[PDB]
């Protein structure tokens, strides 16, 4: 009922269970050329 208590209201629950084909994203910075840098191209360091 839309007027009952707070924990007596419908709560939607999604449970994520983990077990290699799903990872988090990889953040790509910028390419700066003509400077001595410390690169990581796709795991090639």
């Amino acid at each position: 009922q839309p007027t009952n208590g707070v924990g007596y209201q419908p709560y939607r629950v999604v449970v994520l269970s983990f077990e290699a084909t799903v990872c988090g994203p990889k953040k790509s910075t910028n390419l700066v050329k003509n400077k001595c840098v410390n690169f990581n191209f796709n795991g090639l360091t």
Partner: antibody, heavy 117, light 108 residues
């Protein structure tokens, strides 16, 4: 035939131990939902414990740690072992069959325990 | 928890007067109430479950209803075997707390 006949009551010292029994009729103790309830004068009717099909033993917060329930599967019996009984534990104990954990469907006749010096 | 309170704690009523008993629930439950009757040295039967349904063999004398914060049981024709203790109990809150008991007797 619905019967819930109880036993195990008697006079014990404060700080002693005893053991209850609730023989059930025509339904299964270990597979149905039932509960141990108490009634003392001056206080209201009070829930003590509830027991599930296999499930879990759920106690009151006042008696948690002190009472234990161990149903014995040889017949339709339900027990409760009472250890470290306090002074306020003079009550008649009832075994009551539940509709899960909603409401008390059926009751016993109760066995009354008096603890005193 | 819901701490129960019966307002008509003791009611002496003529043999058949359509007597009125009540309780209030200190929290908000929609219709989560069951009414109980404990007789003298007997097993306390349920009377009403869900605050609007008569369970098994409970007659049309009992017309208990109510919601939210006020609940009322109506007893109609008052045989002398109804001189008993009337409880009201919620379904919603663990731990379950019973009513304090309504002592109903018939004057002779």
């Amino acid at each position: 035939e619905v019967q819930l006949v109880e036993s195990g009551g008697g006079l014990i010292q404060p700080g002693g131990s005893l053991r209850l029994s609730c023989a059930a009729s025509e339904f299964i103790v270990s597979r149905n939902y039932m509960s141990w309830v108490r009634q003392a004068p001056g206080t209201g009717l009070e829930w003590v414990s509830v027991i599930y099909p296999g499930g879990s033993t759920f106690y009151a917060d006042s008696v948690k740690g002190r009472f234990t329930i161990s149903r014995d599967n040889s017949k339709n019996t339900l027990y409760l072992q009472m250890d470290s009984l306090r002074v306020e534990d003079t009550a008649v104990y009832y075994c009551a069959r539940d509709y899960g954990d909603f409401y008390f469907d059926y009751w016993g006749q109760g066995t009354l325990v008096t603890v005193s010096s | 928890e819901i701490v129960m309170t019966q307002s008509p704690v003791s009611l002496s009523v003529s043999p058949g007067e359509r007597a009125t008993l009540s309780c209030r629930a200190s929290q908000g439950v929609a219709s989560n109430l069951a009414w109980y009757q404990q007789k003298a040295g007997q097993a306390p039967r349920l009377l009403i479950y869900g605050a609007s349904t008569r369970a098994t063999g409970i007659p049309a004398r009992f017309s208990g209803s109510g919601s939210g914060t006020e609940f009322t049981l109506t007893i109609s024709t008052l045989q002398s075997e109804d001189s008993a203790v009337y409880y009201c109990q919620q379904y919603n809150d663990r731990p379950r707390t019973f009513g304090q008991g309504t002592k109903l007797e018939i004057k002779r």
